[PDB]
Amino acid sequence: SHMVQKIGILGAMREEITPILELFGVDFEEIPLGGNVFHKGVYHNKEIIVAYSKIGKVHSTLTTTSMILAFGVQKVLFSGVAGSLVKDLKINDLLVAIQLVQHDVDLSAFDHPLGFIPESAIFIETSESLNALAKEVANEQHIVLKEGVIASGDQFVHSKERKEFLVSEFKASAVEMEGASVAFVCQKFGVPCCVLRSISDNADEEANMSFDAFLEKSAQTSAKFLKSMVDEL
């Protein structure tokens, strides 16, 4: 029914949604579609649709589209982990993405700026309203929540040279592989989106080792915070 509010909650990997399903604690019906498993439950009278997309831009575009078109979700909250590009963002710290960019798009051979695609824009915006809510919830929990630009692309970044490019070209604070495609799809449909990330690594030569040591704790941190936001919705 259109009288039932529907909220999509997305992560990229199983580990990013496991804690979400546990924290919400209601029974979820499993519904397979398009290679994804959607978990549908009712929490405080809201239908919550939870899924992990699998990694990267094509997987996350597909899953966000299914949530909106097939499940009729009217907000998307994305939760997961990211690599830090700035010294003040340390392991486990939370960032909300005020703008996102696809950092790997390169049509500069035809004089477009890096990150730009025709009919689109370098920077994609998220919901003022939901980010304002994230800030209120962080303040009300005594959690430090940074706001910044997140760069997304289909490579796991693990080099000083790529980090330096991300900071100089886009002034990005963190890097990951899905945010910009989820925020893009939500913008095309006019659906409010929030992208929350907790830092798992520093996107440098050691990033794989950090990512594996910290993924689960960082995914839990983001997942708890997302649950705090749904509790105020």
Next chain:
Amino acid sequence: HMVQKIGILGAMREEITPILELFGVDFEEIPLGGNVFHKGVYHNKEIIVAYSKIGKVHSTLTTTSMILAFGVQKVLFSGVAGSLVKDLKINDLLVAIQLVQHDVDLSAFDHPLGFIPESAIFIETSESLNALAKEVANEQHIVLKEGVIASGDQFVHSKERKEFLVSEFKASAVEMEGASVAFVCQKFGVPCCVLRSISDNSFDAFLEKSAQTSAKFLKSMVDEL
């Protein structure tokens, strides 16, 4: 019972009018997710035609929308691609037997390039549509070339990057949207056929010519479906 619903995607806007005009039936414009879908009925099949837009996110969105919102059961995707190999020339028509996202890189974890966990490097296409393409080609006096198409969100033109696509994936041609549309179709169980006219071994003139011959090719595949 249910009508057959066929989706036709063009990778360039210039390809779209030639398609609608050749089908010769009335098309209704339906906007959705910033895309425009043209819906008509040709020989009692529903035909939904759209430009994919540029880059993998745009084309994943267009394809997922066509499947979920219009119920397309098979997808034909036409466009242009640059050659990576010695035996292709301008205006050759190539059917993609497999595709790859050539820019995917999780090598920090010792995964091979192009690979994502819970996925695979190569994306397959429809044996029965690719066979139909070969039949149509016969009838239209076209030699259909077969190969691997590599797709990524960068324009590929350097010697080093072209030789990488050949050595890493044995790709025959390169473009930006094919892999993502074939991948979405695979996820949903939708037969897909990806056809590309080879652009380089005057662009606007090549584009205008290839759009007409591809329109003609697509319509005669539909005639056999």
